[PDB]
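Internal QA ticket QA-208
Title: Verify multi-chain structure generation after dependency bump
Assignee: T.L.

Test input:
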Amino acid sequence: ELVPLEKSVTHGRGSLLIDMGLFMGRSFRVGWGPNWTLVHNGSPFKVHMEKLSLEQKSRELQSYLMPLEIELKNSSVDRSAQCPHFKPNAGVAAIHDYAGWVRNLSNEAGELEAVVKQWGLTWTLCESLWGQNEYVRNLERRKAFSHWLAHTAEERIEEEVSLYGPERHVEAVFSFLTGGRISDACRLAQKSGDHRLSLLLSQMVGSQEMRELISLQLVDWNKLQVDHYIQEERLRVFCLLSGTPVWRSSDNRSINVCSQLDWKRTLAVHLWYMLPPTATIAQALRLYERAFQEHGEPYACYPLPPYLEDCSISLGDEPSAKFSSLQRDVCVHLLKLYSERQYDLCQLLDPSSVTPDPLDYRLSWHLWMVLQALNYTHLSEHRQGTLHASYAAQLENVGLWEWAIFVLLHIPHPHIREAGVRELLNRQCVVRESPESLAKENFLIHRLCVPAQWVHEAKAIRSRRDGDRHKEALYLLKGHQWNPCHKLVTRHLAADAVINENYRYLQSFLGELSNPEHCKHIQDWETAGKVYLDYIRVIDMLNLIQQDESSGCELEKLHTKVMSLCKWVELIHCYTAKDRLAQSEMAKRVANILRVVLSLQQP
Amino acid sequence: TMSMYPDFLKSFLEHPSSAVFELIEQYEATCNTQITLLKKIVKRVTPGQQKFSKTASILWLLQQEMVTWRLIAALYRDRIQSALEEENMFEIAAPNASEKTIVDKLFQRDTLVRQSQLVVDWLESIAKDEVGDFSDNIEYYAKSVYWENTLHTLKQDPDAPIRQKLPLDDLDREDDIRLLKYLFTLIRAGMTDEAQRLCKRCGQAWRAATLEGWKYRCVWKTCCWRMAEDEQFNKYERAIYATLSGNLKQLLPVCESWEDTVWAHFKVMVDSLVEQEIRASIISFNEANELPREYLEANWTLDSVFEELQATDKKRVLEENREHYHIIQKFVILADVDGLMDEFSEWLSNGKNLLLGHLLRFMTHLLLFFRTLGLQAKEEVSVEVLKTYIQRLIN
Amino acid sequence: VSVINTVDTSHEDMIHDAQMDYYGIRLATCSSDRSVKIFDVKNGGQILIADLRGHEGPVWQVAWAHPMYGNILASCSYDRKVIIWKEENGTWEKTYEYTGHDSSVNSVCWAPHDFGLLLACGSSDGAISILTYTGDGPWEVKKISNAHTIGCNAVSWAPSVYIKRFVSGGCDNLVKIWREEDGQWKEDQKLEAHSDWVRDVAWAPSIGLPTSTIASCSQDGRVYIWTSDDAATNCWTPKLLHKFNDVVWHVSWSITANILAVSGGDNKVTLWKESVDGQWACISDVNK
Amino acid sequence: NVEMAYARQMYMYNEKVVSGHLQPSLVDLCTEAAERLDDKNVSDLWVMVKQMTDVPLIPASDTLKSRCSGQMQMAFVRQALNYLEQSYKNYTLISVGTYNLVRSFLNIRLVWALIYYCMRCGDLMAAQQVVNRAQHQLGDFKNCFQEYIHNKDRRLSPTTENKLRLHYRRAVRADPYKRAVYCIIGRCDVSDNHSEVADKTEDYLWLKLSQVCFEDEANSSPQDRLTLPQFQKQLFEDYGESHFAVNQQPYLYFQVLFLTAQFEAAIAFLFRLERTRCHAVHVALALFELKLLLKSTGQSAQLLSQEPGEPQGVRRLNFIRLLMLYTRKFEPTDPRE
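Actual output:
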């Protein structure tokens, strides 16, 4: 075993500069390889090697499948250049497509992870704003957002109420009010008797002024030094309907109504109770923001990611110096972008915001696609490329194919994109054709428009490094290679076929390379190619013509050709032993044929 | 600058008062002045160098028009201008007539070969050269003598290292690399006495020696071929020797343009026909062809020279081949030019040559010279080309 | 994270470096026992296929070449000899032995297949030799003398984007980028930030990115990230990753997602990935 | 995109300017969007803009004359040299406190070294510290440095500067730091770039600025004096951009011109820079709103037109044609812009 810990003498001589390198040989760093494979060092004691991949909840194939399929169904192909350019369709109700997918998931998502609910929340908020009479439109958006807020808190509110046991107007009523469901809240308030609310459901009208008069009465009571010996937080709840989020009373008590509420509910309360029934979302957002930014107490709660909430950083005497490094949930930034065009898209699109690990990028990528489709492209080319690459890498880590190809193809740079996809193909392509491989190839060719010639070129690279001649040559056939193919066949296949009497194959290959342009470009084409072609053709024609009444013109042609063939057999160059044998065989055969031809002509 | 129509029109017009000779003269002069004015203002920045490269490539169209002009002019003048008329006096010879006179007979005799020789002459006339006093070619390799660094090390001809392997020194090795680069440049350009002036003012024993002969001789050439075949000599020098021998190395011939490798293959055809010519004119001795096969006595014909020069090492069609102005001058030299005129006129009609702002007017002026000097190209092609050019230039 | 087959190298000393092939079917390994061993790890089975002993001193680095040129394996060494092995019909033989160096050759890195079959050799004599196989004939050698004042520790080529460029780091505290201009290798840039000897420099295989990234580990421990947004501008900006207390040895980028693997003298490998905002964050700590 | 960030900046600035509230900060707003937007070119260039242009104004109804009154050059050199020293020391903290970073940096490249480190970190205090440290054998250099630190613009006595000139001509002509200090302080070796320590282009230019004598001292010898016309002329015409490496000049030569006060020249070059169209527009608009751009009369005329009778070389650029072309870019979607 390597010595446990000798780090003194050898360290002093390790700082020596005569051969610091030789003294620093003990070192090692072998990093990566294809598909994130990690090589490393460390009963024999030597070196070990283990894989490396994204193992966090590594079993979700179906989801990948569904949204990826939806994306392809919504994308357009532009084959203007050699490398196609896929572009998303501009705002084709993609947000609706995503919500449907989330609902389909919800059928069997009762027993899934927490990331599912995070994503659901994110997408539905995106829908309630940017989903897409100005006043009427704003009011409808407000109603939808209210529905979302109520729905997302519904479960929590129901759990809380069950815990209350005998209800208390101090807490029970607070929870009901912030979570809506006023129709059931009235049933809960029957202990004292309250049906003016039924009278309200009948005519939803003048609520503003009613509540304002209630507030006036309350503030009169407050200034009159009364309304003090009543229940402590009953007064807290009265201040809520009044419209004061923080009340400093005569006893110097800081009555914070906004306390015990998570950031979302705090903003919601500001929208309905504190602000008038006719208001714009932006103003409310800004007010809430200033609320936790102090004035004067910070009565609102900081927008925290759903996973970082547990341990709100201990703001011991210095809260601000930490807030300037803490992230905020995607929803806030979505609202800000919905209002104005001055914000860092990069912060908004950070994997950590939704899921702690920095390796999951599905949501981020789909959100970037939606943002591109909403005419919001402030993102720099560098970051776009980085995102695409990381997503493709995650895909490859699991083991995906054409979808990573499509992600690569959204990069708006022709050469770079093409090279990337080519490299990807070469590394993953398998020479052994399988049902799955064939399916993938068909997909690529019939959906993403790629060539089978490129597929065969990939196969030929593999079958050249360590592969066999047969497969290499087959793949080169359809790969439109002239010089290399020519060389290959002349050296090995040719003589083998001569001695195995298989010329039909040799001839197909050689004639496909004899076409006007091909023959022009192929080097040494004239020499060897012509030689072999002539041999085969001469045999065949001799046989046929002898049987077919020996046509004289064809006989003359054969004579000319055989003379030319003699002229070339002598010039055959020898580099190997097979060349000699083949040469001799050909010479013998041609001499016999020549004799037969002379016999059938002159005599 | 946009008025490149006016100069061509004024030349064809004053030549419509004048001869064909001054016509082609003014055409080449105009193309030259045009490219030169183009390169007048081409300013580069580290990035701006890329745009200036695009501009020099664009003006390289005017460059190729200038080259096609000079080539077509000299070739047509040799074809049609009376300079082909003389007695068989240069082709008179006897048994005691020297190889000089046998070569004179070949030179007055062979039309195709002499045309190929003029072709090589054009290859050399269009010369790209590294400067003497401004390039490390010899401006830095102007030492008192060659291998002065090696000599100093030893203290502390090409026969020398060929015999003794390891000794050589790297400073002089690099100096010789740059020198031989200069020499391949200058001689493949054909500035032979200037290359000799270099070999002398530097004093490179092997350079002067290997290249001092004024003109058996077959033995000498076979010997040169064998020495080029030998190892251990520099890249450009190896190519220089193989070429002056009648064989091809690759080291510097790795850097042969379509026209440079054309010079190579045409010189190969001409040298092979020259050797077969002397062999027929048996004047040369038997022991002179000491290594018969190691020299290629047989010649390639013009069409095969062109096919080989066009076929790219990637088993492809050459880019300089697919270029048109080069292809145009090529058909003009190869004398398969009326076919190409028909190809371009039908190209306009099938959807080719349309986009190019020059190629139309180029075809116009070229057919103008061709026909007006001699009635070869037909008036049908003439009218189609002239009318398309007329509509374009009217616009 | 998951543990696959653990190989038994049957070695006698510390394996200084390793490197897998293009398709991940083989693993070369080099030790201080003057022996480069080839391992065929396929479907979880450790099989020693070849043992190549041709060096007089310790072997420092091993580099596999692109598949199209065959199974070419380079191995540098202390004995000033760069030995290029080649596999023909299952048999490994020495095809070329470049002995033109005055001190230990420390690093070998092949060029991208687009450029050709070029190999760069960095030696402790402060010289980089570029070997070039033209297909026919021998190897053309272009030696860049006095590249580094003290010595050269590591070389790495740039991804093909064709301008042939490669980055080299030396014991003179300077990271230098080289560029082939007019057929001659000329010094392009001098990046200065380290206060001590540069141990290893590796150019990121940038995928789909306009920016070019290079990582450099050093003796003092500071790992710097050099980035140039535009190749033309050649303005390189460094960014400190983390100052490790112990000497960092080598750095390696992942082919697909650009994740830097850093190894220090503390016998641990720390993986670093850049976030969208820009800050580099460690994702895992794989100790020996 | 980045156009859109600059856009939101513009819309906010315009709404504030219209509603008449307290002045919005174009310069800091650009630098701040750059703080957020992870474009190191944006961050460095906008911080450089604010940090070289954050000098005292002087409207005085004279734009070019106020920008060319020698005190404008003095304040320019102040902000520029201090920012350069600060960036050098903020890089030095990598080789690393201040003196520790400076020494470890003398080793990153590998008492005059410590005093030169104080010069390049902007610390006359550390300079005087190392001064009183090595005042044993150097003598009157401590006193000349003390007078330099007592005169706020680092302006030596004329007799002292003549003494420094003759001194560097006598002895330091063959210690490079001593030669550099004596020459830049006594306005000596003005022709000599002192390439022994001059390894940076901007540092060399700041040494020439420290060599620049701005006054009409008819008793100042002919060649050991640097005038602004000579310096800027050799810098713009004679130095050229193809020498200053137009590659890195997207951050470098524009910077040299904007710090040597070739305002419309830097604006022209960075307007020719594609990725710097909106940037050049923003910088030039900031300056012209400060009334700092000397404008040209004819709009159709070339981007830079020189008036007849104008101080030879002072560049007048058509802001009309410039911003008109810059708005013809995004006119097709953002007529709001």
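Spot checks passed. The first strand of chain D starts at residue 304 and ends at 305.
Status: verified.
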